[PDB]
Motif scaffolding. Structure first.
Motif, PDB file in Angstrom:
ATOM      1  N   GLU A   1     -31.406  16.976 -24.866  1.00  0.00           N
ATOM      2  CA  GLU A   1     -30.622  15.855 -25.378  1.00  0.00           C
ATOM      3  C   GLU A   1     -30.599  15.731 -26.912  1.00  0.00           C
ATOM      4  O   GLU A   1     -29.687  15.090 -27.433  1.00  0.00           O
ATOM      5  CB  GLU A   1     -31.121  14.557 -24.738  1.00  0.00           C
ATOM      6  CG  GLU A   1     -32.606  14.511 -24.625  1.00  0.00           C
ATOM      7  CD  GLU A   1     -33.243  14.724 -25.968  1.00  0.00           C
ATOM      8  OE1 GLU A   1     -33.218  13.776 -26.778  1.00  0.00           O
ATOM      9  OE2 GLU A   1     -33.753  15.836 -26.220  1.00  0.00           O
ATOM     10  N   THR A   2     -31.555  16.303 -27.652  1.00  0.00           N
ATOM     11  CA  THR A   2     -31.431  16.204 -29.106  1.00  0.00           C
ATOM     12  C   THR A   2     -30.126  16.893 -29.488  1.00  0.00           C
ATOM     13  O   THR A   2     -29.559  16.682 -30.554  1.00  0.00           O
ATOM     14  CB  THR A   2     -32.589  16.901 -29.871  1.00  0.00           C
ATOM     15  OG1 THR A   2     -33.853  16.443 -29.373  1.00  0.00           O
ATOM     16  CG2 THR A   2     -32.497  16.574 -31.362  1.00  0.00           C
TER      17      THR A   2
ATOM     18  N   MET B   1     -27.077  14.395 -28.160  1.00  0.00           N
ATOM     19  CA  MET B   1     -26.826  13.414 -29.208  1.00  0.00           C
ATOM     20  C   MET B   1     -26.156  14.085 -30.415  1.00  0.00           C
ATOM     21  O   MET B   1     -25.123  13.614 -30.892  1.00  0.00           O
ATOM     22  CB  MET B   1     -28.137  12.745 -29.663  1.00  0.00           C
ATOM     23  CG  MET B   1     -29.013  12.216 -28.538  1.00  0.00           C
ATOM     24  SD  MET B   1     -29.681  10.567 -28.811  1.00  0.00           S
ATOM     25  CE  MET B   1     -31.068  10.934 -29.822  1.00  0.00           C
TER      26      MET B   1
ATOM     27  N   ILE C   1     -28.047   6.692 -34.948  1.00  0.00           N
ATOM     28  CA  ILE C   1     -28.170   5.963 -33.697  1.00  0.00           C
ATOM     29  C   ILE C   1     -27.148   4.831 -33.695  1.00  0.00           C
ATOM     30  O   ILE C   1     -26.598   4.466 -32.654  1.00  0.00           O
ATOM     31  CB  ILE C   1     -29.616   5.407 -33.535  1.00  0.00           C
ATOM     32  CG1 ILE C   1     -29.742   4.622 -32.232  1.00  0.00           C
ATOM     33  CG2 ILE C   1     -29.973   4.561 -34.728  1.00  0.00           C
ATOM     34  CD1 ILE C   1     -30.236   5.447 -31.070  1.00  0.00           C
TER      35      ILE C   1
ATOM     36  N   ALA D   1     -35.971   6.778 -38.121  1.00  0.00           N
ATOM     37  CA  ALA D   1     -35.623   6.722 -36.673  1.00  0.00           C
ATOM     38  C   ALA D   1     -34.876   7.983 -36.242  1.00  0.00           C
ATOM     39  O   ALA D   1     -35.185   9.081 -36.702  1.00  0.00           O
ATOM     40  CB  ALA D   1     -34.767   5.482 -36.400  1.00  0.00           C
ATOM     41  N   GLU D   2     -33.898   7.824 -35.356  1.00  0.00           N
ATOM     42  CA  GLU D   2     -33.117   8.958 -34.879  1.00  0.00           C
ATOM     43  C   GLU D   2     -31.753   9.019 -35.568  1.00  0.00           C
ATOM     44  O   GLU D   2     -31.203   7.984 -35.953  1.00  0.00           O
ATOM     45  CB  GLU D   2     -32.943   8.865 -33.357  1.00  0.00           C
ATOM     46  CG  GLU D   2     -34.181   9.294 -32.571  1.00  0.00           C
ATOM     47  CD  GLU D   2     -33.990   9.236 -31.064  1.00  0.00           C
ATOM     48  OE1 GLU D   2     -34.859   9.771 -30.339  1.00  0.00           O
ATOM     49  OE2 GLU D   2     -32.982   8.658 -30.603  1.00  0.00           O
TER      50      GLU D   2
END
Ligand SMILES: [Mg+2]
Ligand SMILES: [Mg+2]
Ligand SMILES: [Mg+2]
Ligand SMILES: [Mg+2]
Ligand SMILES: [Mg+2]
Ligand SMILES: [Mg+2]
Ligand SMILES: [Mg+2]
Ligand SMILES: [Mg+2]
Ligand SMILES: [Mg+2]
Ligand SMILES: [Mg+2]
Ligand SMILES: [Mg+2]
Ligand SMILES: [Mg+2]
Ligand SMILES: [Mg+2]
Ligand SMILES: [Mg+2]
Ligand SMILES: [Mg+2]
Ligand SMILES: [Mg+2]
Ligand SMILES: [Mg+2]
Ligand SMILES: [Mg+2]
Ligand SMILES: [Mg+2]
Ligand SMILES: [Mg+2]
Ligand SMILES: [Mg+2]
Ligand SMILES: [Mg+2]
Ligand SMILES: [Mg+2]
Ligand SMILES: [Mg+2]
Ligand SMILES: [Mg+2]
Ligand SMILES: [Mg+2]
Ligand SMILES: [Mg+2]
Ligand SMILES: [Mg+2]
Ligand SMILES: [Mg+2]
Ligand SMILES: [Mg+2]
Ligand SMILES: [Mg+2]
Ligand SMILES: [Mg+2]
Ligand SMILES: [Mg+2]
Ligand SMILES: [Mg+2]
Ligand SMILES: [Mg+2]
Ligand SMILES: [Mg+2]
Ligand SMILES: [Mg+2]
Ligand SMILES: [Mg+2]
Ligand SMILES: [Mg+2]
Ligand SMILES: [Mg+2]
Ligand SMILES: [Mg+2]
Ligand SMILES: [Mg+2]
Ligand SMILES: [Mg+2]
Ligand SMILES: [Mg+2]
Ligand SMILES: [Mg+2]
Ligand SMILES: [Mg+2]
Ligand SMILES: [Mg+2]
Ligand SMILES: [Mg+2]
Ligand SMILES: [Mg+2]
Ligand SMILES: [Mg+2]
Ligand SMILES: [Mg+2]
Ligand SMILES: [Mg+2]
Ligand SMILES: [Mg+2]
Ligand SMILES: [Mg+2]
Ligand SMILES: [Mg+2]
Ligand SMILES: [Mg+2]
Ligand SMILES: [Mg+2]
Ligand SMILES: [Mg+2]
Ligand SMILES: [Mg+2]
Ligand SMILES: [Mg+2]
Ligand SMILES: [Mg+2]
Ligand SMILES: [Mg+2]
Ligand SMILES: [Mg+2]
Ligand SMILES: [Mg+2]
Ligand SMILES: [Mg+2]
Ligand SMILES: [Mg+2]
Ligand SMILES: [Mg+2]
Ligand SMILES: [Mg+2]
Ligand SMILES: [Mg+2]
Ligand SMILES: [Mg+2]
Ligand SMILES: [Mg+2]
Ligand SMILES: [Mg+2]
Ligand SMILES: [Mg+2]
Ligand SMILES: [Mg+2]
Ligand SMILES: [Mg+2]
Ligand SMILES: [Mg+2]
Ligand SMILES: [Mg+2]
Ligand SMILES: [Mg+2]
Ligand SMILES: [Mg+2]
Ligand SMILES: [Mg+2]
Ligand SMILES: [Mg+2]
Ligand SMILES: [Mg+2]
Ligand SMILES: [Mg+2]
Ligand SMILES: [Mg+2]
Ligand SMILES: [Mg+2]
Ligand SMILES: [Mg+2]
Ligand SMILES: [Mg+2]
Ligand SMILES: [Mg+2]
Ligand SMILES: [Mg+2]
Ligand SMILES: [Mg+2]
Ligand SMILES: [Mg+2]
Ligand SMILES: [Mg+2]
Ligand SMILES: [Mg+2]
Ligand SMILES: [Mg+2]
Ligand SMILES: [Mg+2]
Ligand SMILES: [Mg+2]
Ligand SMILES: [Mg+2]
Ligand SMILES: [Mg+2]
Ligand SMILES: [Mg+2]
Ligand SMILES: [Mg+2]
Ligand SMILES: [Pb+2]
Lengths: 210, 1119, 12, 158, 105, 95, 53, 164
Positions: free
Chosen positions: F60-61, F64, F5, F1-2
């Motif tokens: 936004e990467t 975050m 998170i 996933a990211e």
């Protein structure tokens, strides 16, 4: 979800007391009584009776066999009872078919089925009203607490089908989404209706943010 | 290759002409090829006689009589191919002989009048209406007669029904509701059934005692005596009860209609309606429907009998009178002919309506031709039926079977007099009578089910549309080769038996053997078995009988199989299945795919374009072969010659093959070796892995032909020229447009290239101030015209193969108004099997190609041969069709045995016979292995170990003997082409027939960035080149609403579809590198508000404090 | 109530 | 008021009702002036009344018709709101998104949940604007208009 | 500028029907063919509802943006593209009243 | 996933709020100039045709990748609405 | 509910940096693993993987 | 009786045309090529005419009519729109305006604004285009600024890709 008159209705017991039965030829009869009073119940030929000559039957208890009509159970055991009944009776179908959904969801909806009530003791708008229950929690709240002269706004719990529940709501926008647009607007118009964008439906028509 | 076949129930009679339904119907319909002398007078001639004597007398001066002598059509305007190249509807002329009489001297006979250009029928059974072959689908409904059906709500007694079709014909009902009344309804309101019988003559005493002494209900009949005491006066009284306020004195005037001519009439005297009456109720009906005009005093043999059966149906048991409507003898099937005769008669009425007016308009005597006939009505009426009638649609010619199945298809959706859409639960079910009459399975999957159904194999519509099926006779314990095409009703009367009954010939062989009385399975004895079933084939359709071992497949999934085949796309490499049922031959032959030899002879020349054979009669005929023509659906239709130069032909032998036949045998796919195991999830739910090796061979390749077209339109701004001049930028782009304008043949056209060039004018009326300066700066003089040229749409083009250009001074073509000239360009492309394509076997395994593997590594057999396709097993248990697994096995044998077999439907190959052939296969596969020089592998023995621990091979036996056991089971050892190691555990493999399905226009991978917009609603719209926008439905809306997707939902409504100002600033914003503009109001909203203002109401948005706010930005404040 | 007839009755 | 084919023009059915209202209204005025017999004024006031119903909502007292061709209710104004022919069902059946696509799906075994395989060809159209600009950031195309023509045909893409 | 937080249906004052409007469509003159243009005062008339071109006017006295909100001396036409023409309202002045079916039936 | 998170989800009182912060951070990461970042020198963002993501791939990467660290500050009413944009422009160059 | 015999899936593009943020943060498939109906997992080794495992 | 006003002359004309088409539908079995129609009607009737006449005859079709396989598809979603700049046109206007605006500044005002306003502002008059200064200073500057503006626009190529 649309509290309606079922197929084989089960005569619920409006009274909480003790049972008594009888044998003449055409129709059976179940009598429910307390030291106070008794109530006759006509139970025609096809009603297989669940109760016996002998013991107690809580209000809204199944006397006949099978299905119950929400309104009746509401009138007898209360809202708290109709909700709880609606929920479980629904899950009954899903479980029997393998589906495993959380009760939260059915509650959320059921609740909206009873978010409306009637007015028998007014203050502001005359009495056979039928309006949103918290909107009254609002009036009665400031009418007894910040401005005085306790004008008790006496209301009655009201039970409406999921269709009806929404077919008649706060914002006119939402009601014009149904095929009654012609009526929904007429009323909304005449009254000077400020649709406070609360829901999503209404708020999307505008292309506004959810 | 050798052909072994099984099962033996002696196929006593060949299937019928598979198109008999369409063909014969249009034959009896328009009885043209035969002189007016010939006696079949139904249809055209009948509809003609029906409306021709126009007896008009008096309302000033009449005595008119325009008769009809003979109808003779004859010489087609143009021909078939010319009809598809040009856009003309192929139709035969029709002018019949006429003669109008006079009350004074003379009868002018102005012979011919051509009215009506009526379509002809192709030799196969289809039509050629505008440019696309069309088909007329048959229908079902209540067969005009009488029935008594249970009454509506009161559980009490049932009523009557007298059914007269045409519509302009009464509909009667007899119902008794006793405290004081009886109800008989022609049009709507009731009156005594007595008042009517009285008129005809049935007096109270005679009526009561002879019709209903046995029936008490008579008391409701003799009840209102005051009126029953006066006769002919009852005739006027009823007139009185009907209502306008009409003349109490029209002599035998309206009683005539429920009497003799137009309203009642089931088409033909004898068997159309009377059979229904006679087999079901009462005995006679002198005069087709209840009809007489001889003495002024009517005769009704129908009116009393219907009540007779009601007084009867209401009591004990005459017979038991309850009619299952859905019995096939009751719901009658409408063959094409009837459907065109009705439209032909509607038109005749429209013609005769207008003519009547001209009987008064023509001055005195020169009135014959034009003074009584105008062709406008007949044309609009019939033409409307072939082109717009809901009952007619594009011929589904994806391939031969599809056209054949579409041609013989039945549907109830129709006219209005016949069934609509609120109906269906009892019609949609497969009624009992549906046997040998209608396939249970062949219906659509979805909304339409039971509504549209195709008839069974041997089923034939005899004299009036009651589906009859074959049944052979069995007198006593003896079975015969004689056959009775039986009506659905008479079949109840007998004890019928199934084909599958041991038969020594004429002898039935087992005491308690099955038969099926009307609708109920019953173990009868050889001595009661009156009739038997011809064969399993009669129970289903032609499209279904083609499935191998149908018995082993869930009827639910065999449906998918039957519809799968209708989707079969002809592959350059045709190939008949390794296993067939037996109708493949008959399908291509009866459908008109392959070219067959008339009579015996020798071949003269064999062209890629023609086979001029020499018959031995001293004659020789050239047989053109439709080279590469365009099917309505795009598939290619080419006849490839299978006969060499100078060859003596056997009457009826293939000279050329149809689009998809191998050698006279239907072929909709290709036999391919298949391993049935799981891959690295590539064949996940239903996905198929394909061997690149299949593409190397032009195996699943199919020739398709798309047809692009463009018009030179006439604008008031200036004609749109079609010149090789594409204004703004390059010659490289012009190349292939070679011929000044149009694209050069044989040119590969990729998406975007110019297929045809066109030049229209720029603005609406005015030039452009900013564009004026620019042109001036670099070169003022420029061609001020727009580039509206037909470009290749996203998706794909192939190589141009043919072009058409209908410029000025047209030959015999119809160019539309405004249409200055049209330009057609046919493009053809080889569609190779590629990922995304969908292939499926005749059992319903319908999957999509997920991965094309290099022959380098997929599953490989002990000897070098690799498998083509790897099918996942998990798609076999849930679905229930072991038949595919039965086919793969028998297939494995055929591969090493080098032979194809034939396995009938319920009577075919058996597990023991299959295991037998495998037994023979083991020697070809392992025997050569033994002689060629080598024995068994480390791998081969290894898999044996895990297999004996499994339970597939009897422990102890030798590998040689072990692998045979294992092979007979249908599986063999495969080694993973990637590792070379075995696949632990035997895996089955074999020859399975897999077809490729046709790409609909939806497969063109749609994707749309920015583009056109509707005129009124401002939402995204495509069409020719710019892909249309996808729809974002409420169901989808809720999806986003469910998530916190607030902006995502806002944009779907504002920046993507409706915000005019929004999408604009949206694109530009995206172009320069910033976030998108926040949403301006939706046009929907604004449109809605004004829509709402048009109506007295006032919708104003408000503010924080109830105050104004402005949605329409600035255009509504005033001036 | 459907117009034509009322007017017709009116001036007739 | 649109130009369809050759001479075929096409207008929103409301314009027929609006002419109705306008004509009646004017004939009313003219009939009051010219002198007014009572029956004729009423007869018109009646007609005018009905007309005023038609542009609001047809079918509540009887239904108006385009001349012989289509016995069709001329879409009255609420009809346009409520969607009496199922326009509401269409409205919530959906509007059309500007950057959208569709295609057949096929299992992508090694793909991780996190990703999905989308055809480059489809990606080109969908992310065209974002691509155009990016082309200018690179030597591929001098400007947008350029970048666009650069992509107008398939055979042309470096 | 301010976020739209409350929408409200209220009845139409005849003066409000007029306030929303521009001109009075007094004649059934849609569009006369020789020139696809609005006929006379009619439903389609540039004063009452709006221009028929981008920033341009009917006659052409003023054609560029500079004059972005001003109207023409001899003929009325103010302008932003054809879009204004769509969102604008015109009223018919009824002779003697009639009433809204929506409320009456 | 990211990346983290969960770690992110935990740093906010409400799920939907974390999305608002990131998005608003991505907003200004571009607008005031892409070099309005708290983390950069050694191991911050990176994309491979060269290591070129250092300048402008995904906004936004970054947001975050930053918020996951402890330097940003997301409040309900942290810095007065209009003066924030002024100060930012004054201090961040690249236009 | 998708099998691969022919189902077609549509695809949309979130434009704004905002739409992109929510879409890849809260609407990403990997993040919505459990279902809104039952706590029970919605994304699991379904047909071929079980068989393997 | 109509949605689009036609004179009484064009009405009778249509009736005549119609009636003529009737007489001609009396014998050929050929709904007349508009050759017949011209002849039979009379003096100055030709094909361009009748085609024009019948085109004006047809009545307005409904912007709302059942479409294709008759369902909810209403005819209006099909018709495109033409004044509205579809995103490719707003983008062009932006670049064209900024680039043309940059060039216009590197010229002098007099004859560039004259032809820019004369062309861009009002109505497309050499003589009448320039104020006091006659023709020869117009053409003078018109054509020498117009070319230097192009010729550098040729060097920093911004304008060439034709923005239309
Ligand atoms: Mg007591
Ligand atoms: Mg009672
Ligand atoms: Mg008991
Ligand atoms: Mg209560
Ligand atoms: Mg309680
Ligand atoms: Mg309680
Ligand atoms: Mg479960
Ligand atoms: Mg009260
Ligand atoms: Mg209420
Ligand atoms: Mg108080
Ligand atoms: Mg108090
Ligand atoms: Mg309310
Ligand atoms: Mg309704
Ligand atoms: Mg807003
Ligand atoms: Mg062969
Ligand atoms: Mg062979
Ligand atoms: Mg044999
Ligand atoms: Mg053999
Ligand atoms: Mg036999
Ligand atoms: Mg035999
Ligand atoms: Mg006959
Ligand atoms: Mg044509
Ligand atoms: Mg005479
Ligand atoms: Mg029927
Ligand atoms: Mg009938
Ligand atoms: Mg009764
Ligand atoms: Mg009648
Ligand atoms: Mg007798
Ligand atoms: Mg009797
Ligand atoms: Mg009597
Ligand atoms: Mg009468
Ligand atoms: Mg007859
Ligand atoms: Mg009997
Ligand atoms: Mg149908
Ligand atoms: Mg009817
Ligand atoms: Mg049934
Ligand atoms: Mg199907
Ligand atoms: Mg027998
Ligand atoms: Mg025989
Ligand atoms: Mg039976
Ligand atoms: Mg016996
Ligand atoms: Mg089935
Ligand atoms: Mg089924
Ligand atoms: Mg056969
Ligand atoms: Mg020869
Ligand atoms: Mg051909
Ligand atoms: Mg042969
Ligand atoms: Mg094949
Ligand atoms: Mg060529
Ligand atoms: Mg040029
Ligand atoms: Mg022309
Ligand atoms: Mg071998
Ligand atoms: Mg061989
Ligand atoms: Mg076997
Ligand atoms: Mg050996
Ligand atoms: Mg040997
Ligand atoms: Mg295609
Ligand atoms: Mg495109
Ligand atoms: Mg969709
Ligand atoms: Mg705004
Ligand atoms: Mg103002
Ligand atoms: Mg116009
Ligand atoms: Mg409209
Ligand atoms: Mg109209
Ligand atoms: Mg609406
Ligand atoms: Mg309705
Ligand atoms: Mg619609
Ligand atoms: Mg829509
Ligand atoms: Mg992979
Ligand atoms: Mg991997
Ligand atoms: Mg990958
Ligand atoms: Mg493209
Ligand atoms: Mg015009
Ligand atoms: Mg004018
Ligand atoms: Mg004027
Ligand atoms: Mg008036
Ligand atoms: Mg991670
Ligand atoms: Mg943390
Ligand atoms: Mg930095
Ligand atoms: Mg790192
Ligand atoms: Mg590095
Ligand atoms: Mg700055
Ligand atoms: Mg789902
Ligand atoms: Mg599917
Ligand atoms: Mg946004
Ligand atoms: Mg995740
Ligand atoms: Mg949940
Ligand atoms: Mg769920
Ligand atoms: Mg699951
Ligand atoms: Mg005149
Ligand atoms: Mg015409
Ligand atoms: Mg539409
Ligand atoms: Mg537009
Ligand atoms: Mg246009
Ligand atoms: Mg400039
Ligand atoms: Mg001048
Ligand atoms: Mg001057
Ligand atoms: Mg320069
Ligand atoms: Mg140069
Ligand atoms: Mg340059
Ligand atoms: Pb002007």
């Amino acid at each position: 979800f649309e509290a309606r008159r079922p197929k084989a209705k089960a005569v619920i017991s409006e009274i909480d007391g003790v049972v008594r039965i009888e044998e003449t030829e055409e129709k059976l009869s179940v009598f429910v009584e307390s030291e106070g009073f008794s109530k006759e119940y006509k139970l025609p030929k096809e009603a297989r009776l669940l109760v016996k000559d002998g013991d107690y039957v809580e209000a809204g208890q199944p006397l006949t066999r099978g299905a119950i009509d929400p309104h009746q159970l509401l009138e007898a055991k209360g809202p708290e009872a109709v909700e709880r009944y609606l929920v479980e009776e629904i899950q009954k179908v899903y479980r029997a078919q393998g589906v495993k959904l959380h009760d939260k969801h059915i509650e959320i909806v059921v609740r909206q089925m009873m978010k409306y009530v009637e007015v028998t003791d007014p203050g502001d708008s005359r009495l056979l009203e039928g309006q949103v229950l918290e909107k009254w929690d609002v009036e009665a709240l400031n009418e007894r607490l910040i401005a005085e002269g306790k004008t008790p706004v006496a209301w009655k719990p009201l039970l409406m089908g999921v269709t009806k529940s929404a077919l008649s709501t706060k914002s006119w926008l939402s009601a014009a989404s149904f095929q009654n647009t012609t009526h929904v607007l007429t009323e909304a118009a005449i009254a000077g209706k400020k649709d406070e964008l609360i829901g999503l439906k209404e708020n999307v028509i505008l292309g506004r943010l959810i | 290759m050798e052909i072994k076949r099984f099962g033996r129930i002696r196929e006593v009679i060949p299937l019928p002409p598979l198109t008999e339904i369409q063909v014969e119907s249009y034959r009896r319909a328009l009885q043209a090829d035969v002189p007016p002398e010939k006696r079949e007078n139904v249809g055209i001639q009948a509809a003609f006689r029906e409306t021709f004597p126009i007896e008009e007398e008096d309302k000033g001066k009449g005595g008119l009589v325009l008769d009809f002598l003979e109808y003779r059509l004859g010489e087609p305007p143009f021909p078939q191919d010319e009809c598809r190249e040009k856009d003309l509807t192929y139709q035969a002329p029709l002018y019949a002989r006429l003669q109008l009489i006079h009350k004074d001297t003379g009868l002018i006979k102005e012979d011919e009048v051509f009215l009506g250009h009526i379509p002809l029928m192709t030799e196969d059974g289809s039509f050629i209406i505008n440019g696309a072959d069309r088909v007329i689908v048959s229908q079902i409904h209540r067969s005009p007669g009488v029935y008594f059906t249970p009454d509506p709500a009161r559980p009490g007694r049932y009523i009557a029904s007298i059914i007269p079709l045409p519509k302009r014909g009464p509909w009667i009902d007899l119902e008794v509701e006793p405290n004081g009344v009886v109800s008989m309804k022609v049009n709507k309101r009731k009156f005594p059934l007595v008042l009517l019988l009285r008129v005809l003559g049935y007096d109270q005493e005679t009526l009561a005692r002879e019709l209903g002494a046995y029936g008490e209900l008579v008391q409701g009949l003799m009840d209102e005596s005051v009126f029953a005491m006066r006769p002919e006066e009852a005739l006027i009284r009823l007139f009185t009860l009907l209502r306008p306020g009409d003349p109490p004195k029209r002599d035998k005037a309206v009683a005539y209609v429920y009497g003799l001519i137009a309203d009642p009439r089931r088409y033909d005297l004898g068997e159309a309606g009377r059979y229904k009456a006679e087999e079901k109720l009462g005995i006679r009906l002198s005069g087709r429907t209840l009809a007489r005009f001889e003495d002024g005093e009517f005769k009704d043999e129908v009116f009393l009998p219907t009540l007779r059966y009601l007084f009867a149906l209401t009591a004990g048991v005459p017979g038991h009178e309850v009619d299952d409507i859905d019995h096939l003898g009751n719901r009658r099937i409408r063959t094409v002919g009837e459907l065109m005769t009705d439209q032909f008669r509607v038109g005749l009425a429209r013609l005769a309506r207008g003519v009547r007016e001209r009987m008064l308009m023509g001055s005195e005597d020169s009135l014959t031709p034009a003074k009584l006939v105008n062709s406008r009505p007949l044309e609009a009426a019939i033409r409307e039926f072939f082109s717009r009638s809901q009952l007619s649609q594009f011929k589904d010619e994806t391939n031969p079977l599809s056209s054949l199945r579409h041609k013989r298809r039945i549907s109830a959706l129709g006219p209005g007099g016949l069934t609509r859409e609120r109906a269906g639960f009892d019609v949609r079910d497969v009624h009992r009578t549906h046997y040998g009459r209608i396939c249970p399975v062949e219906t659509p999957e979805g909304a339409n089910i039971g509504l549209i159904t195709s008839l069974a194999a041997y089923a034939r519509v005899d004299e009036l549309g009651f589906i009859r099926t074959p049944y052979r006779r069995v007198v006593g314990g003896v079975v015969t080769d004689e056959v009775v095409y039986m009506t659905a009703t008479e079949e109840d009367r007998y004890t019928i038996a199934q084909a599958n009954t041991p038969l020594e010939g004429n002898r039935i062989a087992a005491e308690r053997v099955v038969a099926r009385r009307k609708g109920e399975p019953v173990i009868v004895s050889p001595e009661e078995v009156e009739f038997m079933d011809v064969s399993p084939k009669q129970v289903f359709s032609v499209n279904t009988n083609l499935i191998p071992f149908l018995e082993h497949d869930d009827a639910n999934r065999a449906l998918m199989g039957s519809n799968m085949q209708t989707q079969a796309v002809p592959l350059i490499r045709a190939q008949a299945p390794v296993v067939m049922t037996g109708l493949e031959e008959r399908v291509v032959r009866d459908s008109l795919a392959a070219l067959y030899a008339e009579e015996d002879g020798e071949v003269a020349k064999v062209d890629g374009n023609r086979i001029v054979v020499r018959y031995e009669d001293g004659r020789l005929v050239e047989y053109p072969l439709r080279r590469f023509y365009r099917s309505n659906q795009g598939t290619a239709l080419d006849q490839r010659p299978r006969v060499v130069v100078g060859q003596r032909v056997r009457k009826g032998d293939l000279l050329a093959d149809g689009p998809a036949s191998e050698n006279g045998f239907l072929a909709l796919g290709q036999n391919v070796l298949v391993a049935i195991m799981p891959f690295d999830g590539y064949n996940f739910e239903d996905a198929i892995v394909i061997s690149e090796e299949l593409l190397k061979r032009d195996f699943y390749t199919s020739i398709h032909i798309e047809r692009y077209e463009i018009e030179a339109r006439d604008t008031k701004l200036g004609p749109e020229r079609i010149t090789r001049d594409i204004p703004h930028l390059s010659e490289a782009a012009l190349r292939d447009l070679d011929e000044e304008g149009v694209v050069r043949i044989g040119a590969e056209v990729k998406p975007g290239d110019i297929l045809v060039g066109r030049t229209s004018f720029k603005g609406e009326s005015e030039p452009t101030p900013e564009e004026r300066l620019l042109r001036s700066i670099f070169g003022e003089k420029a061609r001020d015209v727009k580039d509206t040229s037909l470009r290749v749409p996203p998706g794909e083009g192939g190589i141009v193969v043919r072009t058409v250009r209908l410029r000025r001074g047209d030959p015999g073509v119809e160019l539309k108004p405004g249409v200055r000239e049209v330009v057609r360009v046919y493009v053809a492309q080889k569609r190779k099997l590629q990922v995304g394509d969908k292939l499926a076997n005749r059992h319903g395994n319908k999957g999509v190609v997920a991965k094309i593997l290099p022959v380098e590594d997929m599953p490989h057999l002990p000897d070098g041969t690799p498998v083509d396709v790897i099918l996942n097993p998990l798609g076999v248990p849930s679905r229930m069709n072991l038949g595919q697994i039965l086919e793969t096995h028998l297939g494995l044998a055929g591969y090493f045995l080098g032979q194809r077999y034939i396995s009938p439907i319920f009577d075919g190959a058996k597990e023991p016979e299959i295991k037998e052939l495998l037994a023979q296969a083991f020697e070809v596969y392992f025997g050569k292995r033994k002689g060629e020089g080598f024995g068994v592998d480390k791998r081969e023995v290894e898999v044996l170990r895990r297999a004996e621990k499994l339970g597939l091979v009897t422990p102890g036996k030798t590998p040689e003997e072990q692998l045979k056991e294992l092979f007979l089971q249908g599986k063999v050892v495969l080694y993973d082409g990637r590792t070379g190691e075995p696949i632990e555990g035997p895996i089955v493999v074999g020859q399975m027939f897999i077809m490729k399905l046709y790409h609909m226009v939806e497969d063109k991978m749609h994707a749309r960035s920015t583009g056109p917009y509707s005129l009124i609603t401002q939402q995204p719209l495509g069409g020719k080149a710019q892909f249309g926008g996808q729809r974002f439905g409420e169901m989808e809306v809720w999806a986003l609403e469910a998530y916190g997707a607030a902006h995502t939902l806002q944009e779907m409504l504002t920046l993507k579809s409706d915000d005019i100002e929004g999408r604009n600033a949206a694109y530009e914003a995206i172009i320069k590198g910033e976030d998108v503009p926040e949403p301006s109001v939706p046009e929907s909203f604004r449109v809605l508000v004004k829509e709402l203002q048009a109506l007295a109401l006032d919708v104003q948005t408000l503010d924080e404090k109830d105050n104004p706010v402005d949605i329409f930005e600035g255009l509504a404040s005033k001036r | 109530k459907i117009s034509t007839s009322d007017p017709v009755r009116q001036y007739l | 008021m649109v130009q369809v084919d050759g001479g075929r023009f096409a207008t929103s059915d409301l314009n027929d009702l609006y002419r109705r209202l306008i004509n009646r209204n004017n004939r009313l005025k003219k009939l009051l002036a010219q002198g007014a017999p009572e029956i004729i004024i009423r007869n018109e006031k009646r007609m005018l009344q009905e007309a005023v119903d038609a542009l609001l909502d047809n079918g509540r007292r009887g239904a108006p018709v385009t001349n012989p061709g289509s016995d069709r209710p001329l879409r009255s104004l609420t009809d346009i709101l409520s969607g009496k022919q199922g326009r509401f069902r269409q409205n919530l059946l959906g509007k059309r998104v500007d950057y959208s696509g569709r295609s057949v799906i096929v299992v992508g075994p090694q793909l991780k949940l996190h990703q999905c395989g989308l055809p480059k060809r489809m990606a080109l159209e969908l992310f065209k604007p974002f691509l155009l600009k990016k082309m200018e950031e690179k030597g591929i195309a001098p400007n947008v208009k350029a970048a666009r023509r650069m992509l107008e045909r398939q055979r042309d893409i470096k | 500028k301010k976020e739209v937080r409350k929408v409200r249906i209220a009845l139409a004052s005849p003066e409000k029907i007029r306030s929303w409007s521009y001109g009075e469509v007094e004649k059934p003159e849609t569009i006369n063919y020789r020139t696809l243009k609005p006929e006379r005062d009619g439903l389609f008339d540039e004063r009452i509802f709006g221009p028929i071109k981008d920033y341009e006017c009917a006659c052409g006295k003023y054609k560029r943006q500079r004059f972005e909100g001003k109207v023409c001396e001899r003929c009325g036409v103010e302008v932003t593209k054809s879009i204004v023409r769509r969102y604008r309202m015109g009223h018919i002045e009824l002779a003697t009243p009639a009433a809204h079916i929506w409320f009456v039936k | 996933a990211e990346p983290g998170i969960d770690k992110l989800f935990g740093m906010v009182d409400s799920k939907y709020r974390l999305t608002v912060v990131v998005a608003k951070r991505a907003q200004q990461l571009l607008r005031h100039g892409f070099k309005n970042t708290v983390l950069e020198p050694e191991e911050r963002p990176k994309m491979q045709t060269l290591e070129g993501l250092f300048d402008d791939p995904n906004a936004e990467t970054w947001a975050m990748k930053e918020l996951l660290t402890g330097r940003l500050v997301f409040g309900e009413n942290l810095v007065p609405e209009d003066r924030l944009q002024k100060e930012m422009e004054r201090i961040y160059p690249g236009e | 509910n998708a099998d691969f015999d022919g189902d077609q899936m549509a695809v949309h593009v979130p434009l704004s940096s905002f739409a992109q943020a929510e879409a890849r943060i809260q609407m990403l498939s990997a993040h919505n693993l459990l279902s809104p109906a039952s706590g029970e997992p919605l994304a699991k080794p379904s047909r071929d993987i079980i068989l393997g495992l | 009786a109509r949605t689009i006003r036609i004179p009484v002359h064009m009405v009778e004309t249509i009736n005549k045309l119609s009636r003529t088409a009737r007489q001609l539908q009396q014998e050929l079995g050929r709904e007349p090529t508009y050759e017949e129609i011209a002849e039979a009607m009379g003096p100055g009737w030709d094909a361009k005419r009748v085609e024009e006449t019948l085109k004006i005859a047809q009545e307005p079709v409904s912007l709302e009519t059942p479409i294709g396989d008759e369902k909810d598809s209403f005819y209006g979603d099909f018709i495109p729109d033409e004044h509205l700049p579809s995103p490719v046109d707003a983008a062009t206007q932006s670049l064209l305006s900024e680039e043309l605006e940059k060039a216009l500044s590197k010229l002098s005002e007099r004859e560039a604004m004259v032809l820019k306003l004369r062309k861009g502002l009002i109505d497309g008059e050499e003589v009448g285009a320039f104020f006091g200064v006659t023709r020869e200073r117009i053409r003078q500057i018109e054509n020498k600024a117009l070319r230097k503006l192009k010729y550098h626009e040729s060097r920093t190529r911004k304008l060439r890709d034709f923005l239309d």
